[PDB]
Point group: D2
């Protein structure tokens, strides 16, 4: 009877519902028709469109046949049970923040490698994926770009997922440095979000196998986090990174000298693996799904698959909060109060826990290496919405709570 | 149709009249105290009718109609922790477990702190809805000490705004000795130099006595007019032995860290007075619940601090509130907290509740041994860590849900 | 064996039967010695006394000359037979006057103005005084103008502490190395060295423990009087009262050291700060301060009195720490380029020592961004460019540098 | 008018008509000079020819006339330490006192250093006039290691000048785990980062083979053509285990610390070769005496380094040459010295002598236990401290005086 109950609410007193009406109403919830959790429904709608005696009409029996396999998710979407029930209104707010941030033309595109330097400063995109799979994009959201340091929290969650907090943190610290030092007083890199930390974390993953097997193993995790949306690789960026990596070779030799790597590590191979991990490509859309997996406790919103352990996600979000934005980590944690991670390509992987994931991208960076438009957008998002980590959910002054209505 | 009639039928359970003890027992089960300021009219009505035991529909309506909204919320399991009886049972287990952690050293730089028994141990809970639970030595007064730092920081932000306050003080941890950051400002409000500067921003232009009266009235509203006191014995000793604070004060003065016209010597005096403010676990748990409730005191419903003041406070308590254990605490516990040398840990679970954990023995980092152990246990049991997911939380308990 | 007095007579007489008194005094002054030298008192009293009783006006025969000079014949023989460290002293003072005029053109810098007593001084005051390890003197410029020692007292009170307590006791409370800056304590929880404020404050607390500040001050004054050959050592109460009123920086150090248990047991920190401000307010002229520096250059013996003022241990330690930490943040650059133990103060003085050769006091109120006197800095660089006085200049193979210890 | 050769003949003859060749040789050796002294070659060649027994006034003049000046200085006690025989007895006493200090640990990061016996101990003296004394294992080759740092820095300053060299390296102690000072330059040439940058300045434009040959020819002149070698075994081990130096190299390259057109990997290789240069105590004591003699080699009289190079080298050896013990050594010993991980201590007593102390066991700072003990005892005994007075020196001895 759930299919019947849904049928009557969409039909609006009519005997049959046109398929375009059902599809339009489904899209207004935030879900895409291409959502992996609605495939059985969409395949049945397509097949019935082929065999139907009607033009585009669906009676109670035909509707039941089409929607029965995905009735649970469809009932939540149509009964406004998603984390942001009025999704159309929220995306209109996102579009306003996107336009406001678009006006901030300052910053300098990264030019140490030609692959980053080629990007237009005007490229600006923002994608949202809620913990329920509601999607919204504005701007250049289907343009590939390298994750760069945005991969640091992702590989750290993979290390914690497989090894646990205790083992992983025998090699890397868990606090901000407060910085040019590679090691803290305990002779460990400060945290996984700095280069020395990321390099030590890279050395922890899938130990014992060649870099090709390690890379594939990581890629499978990223595919699952992104709901099998675009996760690619730029060998052009990789070759340039490995060529101009004096800074990372200094870290590598220092770490090896200070015995920072697990026994039996080949540091030169680990740096090579690290340069490969930085050169992984995403779009705003696919990377917003990875950030939504982090907002959703390790479950991929658009698939329902458990990708990461709750412990891996909590630790990752803890360290993104305090160490994810370089020298602006403390200011960002204070004013924005959201777990975020930036990369030198212009990415800002943003998590609003229990609500949504985002990817903001604009190549021009500020003097701290963070995307000008992304930083602007993040501040405006928290000015508008009660998404700050320490904003109250009952008493939030002139802020808007999109979880309300 | 009448909310009072509806509530009467649920408590009566088919009977013509509800005995007063039955209603009081049921009310207390929700977590509310009969002495709750928002229930004053109901209790004054009950006392008048008690002067004349059985409450009929008419007498029940007459007693409860003034506070029917909150009473309906309480009886209809609409509070942040619906099954409060079950939750206070877990708090009691966590309390008994931390009770066995008898290690640490009671502070002995001043004799007022050194006098406190190491076996004094208390935990008080105040939810964002005013549900209360105490276990241990929760009515024994002790000095807030550095537990006052986030409270005076909240007052300064409340009255002056974020930008003005942060002209004088930073907003980040220093990273594991220096009084000033690269910008010649104390690192944050949670360290002594930062707190000393935050002290100089409050009620500028008036004498210390008026400033202290102003801060006391503020803490009274924050605690819902529950116990707030002052220990002159502690103030005299802190001042006599505050060489570290005098070194900071002269350094800040030399470095021009204070607003123009500051009397540094008078500011240090005010600062030692604020450190010597006394609270109980019970009254300090209400202060922490005002911070968990976006500035509204949960037992009075009063707007005490701006949402901005509270948000900034919790942010800096999260990263800077536990001295050298701040980074470890934010990672493992993930709750905004503030410890003091008297053994108090002011703990906030945003949107859920405030707490005051108190036991005088401190660890090598200056934090209460029992309190630290208790915070770790609380977050192992419940999905209260900042970055614990509210939908998928593994085998942890969520006291916000029914079953 | 012919008389030493007769030998000296024949060399000054130049074949004549009698030497005129002005001839002997002119020849004496040309050595660098002053007639007012405390070691020549008996000679000068007898010259003045014989000038009253003389029958042949302005004439000294063999016997009359013997009568005057016999009491100080040893020093006079060294002076006249060119046995002093700088034998051609007139040529050397000519070079000093050239360096002085060169540095006088360096009118840059800012006079210290945190206390009105320092801000009062004219930027044009510039003096240079020399006192060799043999008592040879030379002054050019404003050498008789009193000014406070300020941080130039740091090596002197340190020398006093080592003289009385020894290296071991003193360095239990203070370090012996440059810091490398804004920290009051090193990794061992001690002030880095005695030449920084925290170190000087700690050294102040080691001197004459147990007695009041009046007895402590008098004790240090007696030492400074002997180091300066009983020449001008005064006190500026005006400067002292201003220093104690605006010494928040020093009060911060004081409470920090007291908190960190940096002082000897039973120290009254506020009284030590008070004594420390009094030590900073001690006044000297270029001349009297150049004698203090020459006592340090002469292994603890005062060159103009011959008196042992400090132990060789005290002097060696002071010069070691003046060389590496004496010029604030310019210490390393000064140690490398000038290679001379030196100490600067905020009044514009630079207490300079050329070990085994001479002491100096360069003074000009305008300071550079480091706190060092502009004229004094430039003068020190010119001195070492001209002369082989650098700590590590070779005394045998010194390229085109001049060596004033040689005849030519 | 009477010949200097005849004059010297009469002072050695002692009323005799002829001087036996053994008497002259014995008398020359007591001055401190060795018969193998390169400035005495013409005298010794003449002696061997006339041999391949009795030398008359004519045969003595025939043998000594070419070197009469140096021989007259030696026999007329004109050398820097006139009573050299007495001085060498005090050195033997200091050597024997340090010999008993059996503590320390021989370096083992490379098997080449680890192979050395901890009982190996030698002390060599070469005055600025070429007077020689040796006690212990003074003819045993060992690697210079960081003892080469002052020597390559002297070469760099000799060839490029102070201004040029110091655009790449500082001139002060760091007072330390940082590779670069505030100005993005290595702190000084005596630390590893500084030495590596100094290495990149030597003979720019040519290959490492020509560069190494050039440094070797310079070290030959410094040592008066005495033993200077190379340990390829030490070199291959330093390359295999130089992670610390590769981290420095990549850091310097990233921070643009090298002159334009520098191949850093090739520079690190040249640096490992420079560290692997072997000397004996005797040959290295002559290098140290070239530094004590203002750039002139005492046993050849050749100008090897410019005064500027030597003055700058001694300034930096004074404050930077003993690692974490630099400041304590500058204060207590007051002498320009440079230590190496093989046990060497290149010691300079300006205007007096050069020395090489060698004993493989090192203390926690990396300095030779016996070498450090020896340096302290030498300055306890003699007024050799940089800030000892030459006139008033309490109970110390001045070997430069006759008695
Ligand atoms: N200005 C500059 N010059 N060279 C620089 N670097 C050289 C390579 C890097 N060296 C380090 N990385 N981590 C380090 N950790 C420690 O020292 C441990 C420690 C930290 C804090 C207090 C006490 C101890 S040293 C950075 S930075
Ligand atoms: N070991 C010790 N000795 N003296 C000590 N104190 C003396 C008084 C206090 N001094 C300071 N407080 N804050 C400072 N800040 C800076 O220097 C600015 C800066 C901060 C961080 C990075 C770079 C620059 S100095 C503590 S601590």
């Amino acid at each position: 009877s759930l299919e019947d109950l849904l049928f009557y609410t969409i039909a609006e007193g009519q005997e049959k519902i046109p398929v375009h009406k059902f599809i339009t109403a489904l899209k207004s919830t935030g879900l895409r028709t291409s959502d992996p959790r609605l495939k059985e429904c969409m395949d049945m709608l397509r097949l019935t469109l082929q065999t139907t005696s009607d033009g585009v009409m669906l009676d109670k029996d035909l509707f039941k046949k089409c929607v029965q396999s995905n009735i649970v998710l469809l009932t939540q979407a149509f009964r406004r049970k998603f984390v942001i029930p009025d999704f159309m209104s929220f995306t209109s707010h996102i579009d306003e923040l996107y336009e406001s941030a678009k006006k901030q033309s300052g910053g300098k595109v990264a030019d140490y490698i030609p692959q980053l330097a080629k990007f237009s400063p005007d490229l600006w995109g923002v994608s949202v994926c809620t913990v329920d799979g509601q999607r919204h994009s504005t701007g250049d959201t289907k343009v590939p770009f390298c994750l760069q340091s945005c991969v640091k929290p992702l590989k750290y969650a993979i290390a914690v997922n497989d090894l646990g907090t205790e083992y992983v943190h025998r090699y890397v610290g868990k606090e901000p440095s407060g910085n040019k030092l590679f090691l803290n007083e305990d002779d460990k890199p400060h945290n996984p979000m700095v280069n020395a930390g990321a390099i030590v974390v890279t050395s922890l993953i899938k130990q014992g196998v060649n870099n090709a097997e390690k890379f594939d193993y990581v890629m499978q995790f990223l595919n699952k986090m992104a709901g099998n949306e675009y996760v690619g690789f730029s060998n052009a960026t990789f070759q340039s990174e490995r060529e101009s990596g004096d800074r990372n070779f200094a870290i590598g030799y220092y770490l090896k000298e200070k015995k920072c790597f697990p026994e039996g590590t080949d540091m030169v191979g680990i740096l090579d693996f690290y340069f490969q991990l930085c050169s992984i490509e995403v779009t705003c859309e696919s990377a917003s799904v990875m950030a939504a997996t982090l907002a959703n406790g390790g479950f991929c919103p658009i698939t329902g698959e458990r990708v990461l352990s709750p412990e891996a996600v909590r630790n990752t979000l803890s360290l993104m909060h305090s160490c994810g934005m370089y020298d602006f980590s403390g200011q960002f944690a204070f004013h924005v109060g959201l777990p975020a991670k930036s990369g030198v390509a212009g990415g800002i992987l943003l998590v609003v826990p229990n609500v949504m994931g985002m990817m903001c991208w604009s190549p021009p960076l500020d003097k701290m290496g963070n995307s000008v438009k992304g930083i602007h957008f993040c501040h405006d998002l928290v000015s508008l919405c009660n998404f700050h980590n320490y904003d109250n959910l009952r008493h939030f002054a002139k802020k808007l709570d999109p979880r309300r209505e």
